[PDB]
Amino acid sequence: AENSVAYSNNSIAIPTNFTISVTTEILPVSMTKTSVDCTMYICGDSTECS
Amino acid sequence: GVGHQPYRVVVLSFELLHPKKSTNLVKNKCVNFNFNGLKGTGV
Numbered sequence A: 001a002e003n004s005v006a007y008s009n010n011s012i013a014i015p016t017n018f019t020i021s022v023t024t025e026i027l028p029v030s031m032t033k034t035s036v037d038c039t040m041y042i043c044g045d046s047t048e049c050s
Numbered sequence B: 001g002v003g004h005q006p007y008r009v010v011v012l013s014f015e016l017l018h019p020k021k022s023t024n025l026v027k028n029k030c031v032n033f034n035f036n037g038l039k040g041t042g043v
């Protein structure tokens, strides 16, 4: 939305009331831990491929 | 005699253009299996 602050060199704007806002912030920390095997993934139950 | 006796002879011609007998099924032991051309290794 277009706004225009009414600026002049003798006028100020002071709040007379307030509000208390509780906002939410979501942050990732860790991810899934995985582990791999060579022979079970690549060949798998194969002696000559191992 | 033997050389003059009639003999029943079967002549079997083979056309070389194209099987194995199935073995016992083994469970709970890791074997290399053939199943109708599907080859693998497992329990």
Ligand SMILES: *[C@@H]1O[C@H](CO)[C@@H](O[C@@H]2O[C@H](CO)[C@@H](O[C@@H]3O[C@H](CO[C@H]4O[C@H](CO)[C@@H](O)[C@H](O)[C@@H]4O)[C@@H](O)[C@H](O[C@H]4O[C@H](CO)[C@@H](O)[C@H](O)[C@@H]4O)[C@@H]3O)[C@H](O)[C@H]2NC(C)=O)[C@H](O)[C@H]1NC(C)=O
Pocket: A016, A017, A018
């Ligand atoms: C500074 O700002 C604060 C809050 O922003 C004001 O303080 C009080 O605010 C409350 C809430 O507005 C006033 O209480 C009553 O609000 C009712 C509306 O309730 C709805 O909205 C609130 C959230 O604002 C929801 O929680 C609620 O579930 C509803 O959805 C009005 O209907 C009430 O009006 C009734 O009472 C007045 C007398 O107070 C009668 O004159 C009316 O006819 C009607 O019967 C009421 O307004 C509470 O009144 C505010 N306090 C005061 C002292 O006014 C401050 O007023 C404000 N300014 C300053 C200078 O601090």
